[PDB]
Design a protein around this ligand. Structure first.
Ligand SMILES: Cc1ccc(-[n+]2[nH]c(C(C)(C)C)cc2NC(=O)Nc2ccc(-c3ccc(CN4CCOCC4)nc3)c3ccccc23)cc1
Length: 330
């Protein structure tokens, strides 16, 4: 066992090992990792075991981060607790490499060059292909969930910019039976945004959002229309069939034609027809970076627990289990 030291940052108390120095708020804190001489990010889980929800939510995030090992996905450097036993196990801290900024700020500086868009979207798809391997769906892919530093290297993550604007329609209206291409749809909204600099579908609510989406992609067709279970949506769609649609080559005038093609294949209402992460990686638009041998999938991930209903102390224990069994990366 290490040796921690107390400290209070903006009301929050912090008990981390001497190994980490210069804690500076950013709730997460920026710190210096004395063991590697690298700057890190330290997130103290708020009230991890306050309710069964937080306990499961706390356990879920720990299991995930411990499983993610890809250059384009946030990875767990360290997970510690000032607790010396399970009984006194009330605090959880997670550690990762510090980073530059959201794809927000890193875009506020410009509109991004076509090569920058290729490289950025290319790393999102590479990280996406990986996590999709473990049958994991992000469900909240958006500018603020992407970390990019100076080198222009990207990494996906989830902080827990309306997520709305990027949400796929199957998921926004809910039919309970989606797929991983919910994420690809979001990628299309971000990609489009980098190329144009402006938000593709800046709706005000779920009703506004849909109007925006349809005015571009058009109203559902027979094939897509006979796949909608809920009559409620079925009726709405077949009613508001009035929205002057568009033709991508126009909506994105002057963009790499390879780029507008990709979008066409990402921004489809039919999740059954939407391109996948692995398929987009092979799109000619990324021909400059694509390498089928450096685009790894993930080991299978056990999501059994998602369906279990346990006490707070049980989720707490499994969480403690995960904390002790942590094997730091090389
Ligand atoms: C209930 C549940 C379940 C899962 C869940 N997921 N899922 C994922 C996927 C694998 C799907 C992408 C990731 C993820 N959670 C995640 O990545 N958590 C974190 C987010 C964010 C930070 C974090 C904050 C500020 C900063 C500092 N600023 C400087 C400027 O640039 C932006 C970043 N850095 C990092 C962080 C830090 C340490 C440790 C963890 C962290 C989140 C909640």
């Amino acid at each position: 066992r290490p040796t921690f030291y107390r400290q209070e940052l903006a009301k929050t108390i912090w008990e981390v090992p001497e190994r980490y120095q210069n804690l500076s708020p950013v709730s997460v804190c920026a710190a210096f990792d004395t063991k590697t001489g690298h700057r890190v990010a330290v997130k103290k889980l708020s009230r991890p075991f306050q309710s069964i929800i937080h306990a499961k939510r706390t356990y879920r995030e720990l299991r995930l981060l411990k499983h993610m090992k890809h250059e384009n996905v946030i990875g767990l450097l360290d997970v510690f607790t000032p607790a010396r036993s399970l009984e006194e196990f009330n605090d959880v801290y997670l550690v990762t490499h510090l980073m530059g900024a959201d794809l927000n700020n890193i875009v506020k500086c410009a509109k991004l060059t076509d090569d920058h868009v290729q490289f950025l979207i290319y790393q999102i798809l590479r990280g996406l292909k990986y996590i999709h391997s473990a049958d994991i769906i992000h469900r909240d892919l958006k500018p603020s969930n992407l970390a990019v530093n100076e080198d222009c290297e990207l990494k996906i993550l989830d902080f827990g910019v309306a997520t709305r604007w990027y949400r796929a329609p199957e998921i926004m209206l809910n039919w309970m039976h989606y797929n991983q291409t919910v994420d690809i749809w979001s990628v299309g909204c971000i990609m489009a945004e980098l190329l144009t600099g402006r938000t593709l579908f800046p709706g005000t609510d779920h009703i506004d959002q849909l109007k925006l989406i349809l005015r571009l992609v058009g109203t559902p067709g027979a094939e897509l229309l006979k796949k909608i279970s809920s009559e409620s949506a079925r009726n709405y769609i077949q009613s508001l069939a009035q929205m002057p649609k568009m033709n991508f080559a126009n909506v994105f005038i002057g963009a790499n034609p390879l780029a507008v093609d990709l979008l066409e294949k990402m921004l489809v209402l039919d999740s059954d027809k939407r391109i996948t992460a692995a398929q987009a990686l092979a799109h000619a638009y990324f021909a400059q970076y694509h390498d089928p041998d450096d685009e790894p999938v993930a080991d299978p991930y056990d999501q059994s627990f998602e369906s279990r209903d346990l006490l707070i102390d049980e989720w707490k224990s499994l969480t403690y289990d995960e904390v002790i069994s942590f094997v730091p990366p090389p």
